[PDB]
Amino acid sequence: GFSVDGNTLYDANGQPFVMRGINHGHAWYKDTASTAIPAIAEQGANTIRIVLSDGGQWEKDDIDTIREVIELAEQNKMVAVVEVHDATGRDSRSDLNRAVDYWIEMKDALIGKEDTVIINIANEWYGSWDGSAWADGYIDVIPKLRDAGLTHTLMVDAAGWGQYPQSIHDYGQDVFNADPLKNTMFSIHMYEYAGGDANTVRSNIDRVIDQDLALVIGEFGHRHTDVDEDTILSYSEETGTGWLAWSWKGNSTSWDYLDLSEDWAGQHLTDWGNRIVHGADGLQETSKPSTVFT
Numbered sequence: 001g002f003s004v005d006g007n008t009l010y011d012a013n014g015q016p017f018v019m020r021g022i023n024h025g026h027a028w029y030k031d032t033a034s035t036a037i038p039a040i041a042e043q044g045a046n047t048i049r050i051v052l053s054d055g056g057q058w059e060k061d062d063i064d065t066i067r068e069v070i071e072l073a074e075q076n077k078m079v080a081v082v083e084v085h086d087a088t089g090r091d092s093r094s095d096l097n098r099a100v101d102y103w104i105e106m107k108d109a110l111i112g113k114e115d116t117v118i119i120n121i122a123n124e125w126y127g128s129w130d131g132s133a134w135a136d137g138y139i140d141v142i143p144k145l146r147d148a149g150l151t152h153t154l155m156v157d158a159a160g161w162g163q164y165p166q167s168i169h170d171y172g173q174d175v176f177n178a179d180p181l182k183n184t185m186f187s188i189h190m191y192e193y194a195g196g197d198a199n200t201v202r203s204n205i206d207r208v209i210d211q212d213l214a215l216v217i218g219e220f221g222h223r224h225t226d227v228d229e230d231t232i233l234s235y236s237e238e239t240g241t242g243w244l245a246w247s248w249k250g251n252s253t254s255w256d257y258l259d260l261s262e263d264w265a266g267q268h269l270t271d272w273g274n275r276i277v278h279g280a281d282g283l284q285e286t287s288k289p290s291t292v293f294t
């Protein structure tokens with residue numbers, strides 16, 4: 001399937017793949033799948049990041065639901081970055097363990113799909129700014145996922161709710177080395193801390209890619225009440241760094257400035273959605289499908 005060599009992610013045809021896509025809050029709106037996933041593909045996204053629940057905080061996504069969402073993605077010519085969200089911001093190892101068990105439990109939905117699915121082990125596990133503690137978690141669990149027969153590229157979110165990318169700079173190679181398949185990439189979520197201005201965006205990207213580690217900005221936003229989405233897009237394009245905007249629809253009121261679409265079908269994008277789809281360095285301009293799809 002997918003493979004990582006230095007700071008590049010390669011598709012199953014060996015062609016570099018640069019993620020340009022959208023997060024979708026599937027776990028909380030499970031019945032929107034057949035509308036939302038194809039609508040995201042219609043915007044030119046080459047990758048969808050699909051929010052799943054392991055039952056820790058929300059309604060567990062069962063094996064049939066996983067199969068359903070994956071299939072909707074690959075049959076609309078998107079790679080599926082699957083992620084478990086129930087450990088968000090938690091420092092406790094038990095929350096990471098729960099996500100790891102979930103992947104193992106659900107392995108029969110994932111095995112064989114390594115050319116179209118990438119596994120983001122847990123959304124924003126380890127909220128505190130502590131690179132060592134963060135690393136120790138992944139060093140312990142990545143070999144267990146490999147032992148279970150999962151050969152997918154794995155995606156690991158930075159510490160600090162994704163906003164402490166120093167963790168990846170300092171310890172990301174140690175994490176990568178713990179993977180016996182050497183097929184692990186990293187993600188930063190850029191909001192007001194990690195994406196607060198142009199210098200910060202570029203330095204945070206540089207501090208990973210200059211360790212010869214592969215990188216996606218697996219979530220990012222825009223200025224609210226800031227966040228430099230223009231530099232995230234432009235510098236990502238310059239450096240071949242992947243990105244995934246947050247999110248299609250359904251944020252709670254406090255975060256609803258983050259909805260990219262007014263409707264589930266994507267007929268009415270928000271200003272934010274239009275920026276991501278139709279603006280400079282956005283999906284229409286820069287998103288290329290994985291060559292597994294043609």
Ligand SMILES: OC[C@H]1O[C@@H](O[C@H]2[C@H](O)[C@H](O)[C@H](O[C@H]3[C@H](O)[C@H](O)[C@@H](O)O[C@@H]3CO)O[C@@H]2CO)[C@@H](O)[C@@H](O)[C@@H]1O
Pocket residue numbers: 027028029058088250251252253255
């Ligand atoms: O509570 C009933 C209502 O829930 C809706 O799903 C919510 C989830 O339970 C979470 O609370 C979810 O939280 C996310 C926020 O919306 C922001 O996206 C974000 O940054 O992160 C958090 C989680 O980390 O929000 C949704 C929506 O409010 C939904 O399932 C609905 O059907 C139901 O009636």
